Design a protein around this ligand. Structure first.
Ligand code: NAG
Length: 259
C-alpha cells in the first residue's frame, strides 16, 4: 500500500525491534530509558521474556524472545488451531497450537507481573513486543491484556500468522487497526521474510494489525504501510521459511548486540 512513515514512528519501530532482538541475548544494550524487571520463563516450552518499565514514556513493556532452542522450534511447527479459551469473549477465536502452549506455560507469570507493575503505575500504558515466536507470544499476551487494561500496544517483528480470522478481527477491533492513524497494533515485516507467510492462509490462518513493511535499504522513507485484504507487501514476496530477511530487522540481527 502506502510508501513512507514519519521519523517519530520509524524511531519507535526501531526501538521495539531493538528490544525484541536483544531478548535473544539477555537484553544487551536496550535503551537507557528502560528498567529491567523480572524474567519470564518456563522450562517445558523454553519461553523466555521479561517485564520492563520506561518511565520516560510511561509504559510497561513485556518482551518475548523468539526461537532459540530445539524446544522452541517444536512449538513453531504445531499448526493445529486451538480455541483461545483465555479470552471467552473472543468469539470463535482460535490460535496457533504451539504458541498457545507457549502462552499457557507463562500466562500466570505474565499476568501476575504485569498486574504488579500496572497496580503501581496505573497511568502507564502497556506495550508488548517480540520477534518471530516472540511476536506470536506478544500477540496472544496483548490480546489477553486488552480485555482488562487500557492503552495496550503491540509491536511485532517477523510475526507468523498467530491464529484464525476471528482472532485477527478481534485484534483489529481491540487495537483500532481500521486506520494507520489510530492503530495500536504495528505488525512489522521485512523484505521477503518467509515467517509472515506461515502457517499458510489456506490452513485457516490470518494476520491482523497494520503491516509496516521494511524494504531495503531500511529507512522511514522505504517503509510501507499496508492495509486491507489484497496480497501485498511482505506476503507478496513469497519468501520461504527462516531466511536472511527474517533474522535482521532495521539492520539488527537476533542476539547480535551490534546496536
Ligand atoms: C498442538 O498444540 C495444542 C494446544 O494448542 C495441543 O493440544 C496439541 O496436542 C499439540 N500437538 C502436538 C502434536 O503436540
Amino acid at each position: 500500500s502506502t510508501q513512507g512513515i514519519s521519523e517519530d514512528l520509524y524511531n519507535r519501530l526501531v526501538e521495539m525491534a531493538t528490544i525484541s532482538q536483544a531478548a535473544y541475548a539477555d537484553l544487551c544494550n536496550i535503551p537507557s530509558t528502560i528498567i529491567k524487571g523480572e524474567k519470564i520463563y518456563n522450562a517445558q516450552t523454553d519461553i523466555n521474556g521479561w517485564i520492563l518499565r520506561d518511565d520516560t514514556s510511561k509504559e510497561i513493556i513485556t518482551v518475548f524472545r523468539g526461537t532459540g532452542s530445539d524446544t522452541n522450534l517444536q512449538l513453531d511447527t504445531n499448526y493445529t488451531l486451538t480455541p483461545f479459551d483465555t479470552l471467552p469473549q473472543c468469539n470463535d477465536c482460535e490460535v496457533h497450537g504451539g504458541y498457545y502452549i507457549g502462552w499457557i506455560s507463562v500466562q500466570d507469570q505474565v499476568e501476575s507481573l504485569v498486574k504488579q507493575q500496572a497496580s503501581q503505575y496505573p497511568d502507564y500504558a502497556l506495550t508488548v513486543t517480540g520477534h518471530s515466536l516472540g511476536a506470536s507470544m506478544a500477540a496472544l499476551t496483548a490480546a489477553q491484556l486488552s480485555a482488562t487494561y487500557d492503552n495496550v500496544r503491540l509491536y511485532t517483528f517477523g510475526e507468523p500468522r498467530s491464529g484464525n480470522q476471528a482472532f485477527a478481527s478481534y485484534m483489529n477491533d481491540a487495537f483500532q487497526v481500521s486506520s494507520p492513524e489510530t492503530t495500536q497494533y504495528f505488525r512489522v515485516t521485512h523484505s521477503n521474510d518467509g515467517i509472515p507467510n506461515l502457517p499458510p492462509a489456506e490452513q485457516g490462518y490470518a494476520h491482523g494489525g497494520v503491516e509496516y513493511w521494511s524494504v531495503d535499504p531500511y529507512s522511514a522513507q522505504n517503509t510501507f504501510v499496508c492495509t486491507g485484504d489484497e496480497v501485498q507487501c511482505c506476503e507478496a514476496q513469497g519468501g520461504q521459511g527462516v531466511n536472511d530477511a527474517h533474522t535482521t530487522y532495521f539492520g539488527m540481527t537476533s542476539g547480535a548486540c551490534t546496536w
